[PDB]
């Protein structure tokens, strides 16, 4: 017997709740990350969906 499932999803570098996803790369990234991407002309949209912000 053995198990090892990861629950919450946090950036492997920032370790912060991932509330975004980069299309181009097709991977999930955190908020801080976005900055870089959004700067490199990378498409990024919120997972949870639309919010007040």
Q: In the complex, which residues of this chain contact Zn ion (CB under 5 A)?
A: 11, 14, 22, 25, 30, 33, 37, 42
Q: How far is the CB of 53 from Zn ion (least distance, A)?
A: 19
The counts of H helices and E strands in the chain are 1, 3
Question: Interior CA angle at 10 toward 5 and 13, to 5°?
Answer: 115
Q: How far is the CB of 31 from Zn ion (least distance, A)?
A: 8
Strands of the chain, DSSP E: 20-22, 27-29, 44-45
Q: How far is the CB of 9 from Zn ion (least distance, A)?
A: 11
Between residues 9 and 14, which has the closer beta carbon with respect to Zn ion?
Answer: 14
């Amino acid at each position: 017997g053995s198990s090892g499932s990861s629950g919450e999803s946090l950036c492997p570098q920032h370790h912060e709740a991932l509330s975004l996803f980069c299309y181009e790369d097709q991977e999930a990234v955190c908020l801080i990350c976005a900055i870089s991407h959004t700067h490199r002309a990378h498409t990024v949209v919120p997972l949870s969906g639309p919010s007040s912000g």
